[PDB]
Design a protein around this motif. Structure first.
Motif, mmCIF file in Angstrom:
data_model
loop_
_atom_site.group_PDB
_atom_site.id
_atom_site.type_symbol
_atom_site.label_atom_id
_atom_site.label_comp_id
_atom_site.label_asym_id
_atom_site.label_seq_id
_atom_site.Cartn_x
_atom_site.Cartn_y
_atom_site.Cartn_z
ATOM 1 N N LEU A 32 35.350 35.019 76.956
ATOM 2 C CA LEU A 32 35.245 34.636 78.728
ATOM 3 C C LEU A 32 35.864 33.452 79.198
ATOM 4 N N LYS A 33 36.846 33.313 80.138
ATOM 5 C CA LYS A 33 37.158 32.204 80.298
ATOM 6 C C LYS A 33 36.300 31.229 81.453
ATOM 7 N N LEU A 34 35.603 32.030 82.215
ATOM 8 C CA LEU A 34 35.195 32.138 82.792
ATOM 9 C C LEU A 34 34.078 31.272 83.460
ATOM 10 N N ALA A 35 34.593 30.132 84.249
ATOM 11 C CA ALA A 35 34.083 28.808 84.779
ATOM 12 C C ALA A 35 33.771 28.938 86.240
ATOM 13 N N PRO A 36 32.504 29.276 87.061
ATOM 14 C CA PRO A 36 32.558 29.046 88.113
ATOM 15 C C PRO A 36 31.735 28.519 88.742
ATOM 16 N N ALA A 37 31.089 27.165 88.416
ATOM 17 C CA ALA A 37 31.053 26.160 88.420
ATOM 18 C C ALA A 37 32.451 24.952 89.142
ATOM 19 N N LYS A 38 33.675 24.860 88.144
ATOM 20 C CA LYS A 38 34.627 24.557 87.563
ATOM 21 C C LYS A 38 35.478 24.909 88.996
ATOM 22 N N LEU A 39 35.358 26.166 89.719
ATOM 23 C CA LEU A 39 35.805 26.303 90.910
ATOM 24 C C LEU A 39 34.827 27.106 92.298
ATOM 25 N N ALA A 40 34.152 27.477 92.179
ATOM 26 C CA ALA A 40 33.663 27.899 93.255
ATOM 27 C C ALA A 40 32.332 27.505 94.046
#
Length: 24
Positions: free
Chosen positions: A3-11
């Motif tokens: 998982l490359k999901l980095a929500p803190a960097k986008l959302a």
């Protein structure tokens, strides 16, 4: 599975967040 999901960097738009942090 990697998982490359980095929500803190986008959302982190603060919307909803800063509202509920004020309990709005």
């Amino acid at each position: 599975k990697k998982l490359k999901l980095a929500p803190a960097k986008l959302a982190l738009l603060w919307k909803a967040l800063a509202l509920k942090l004020k309990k709005a």
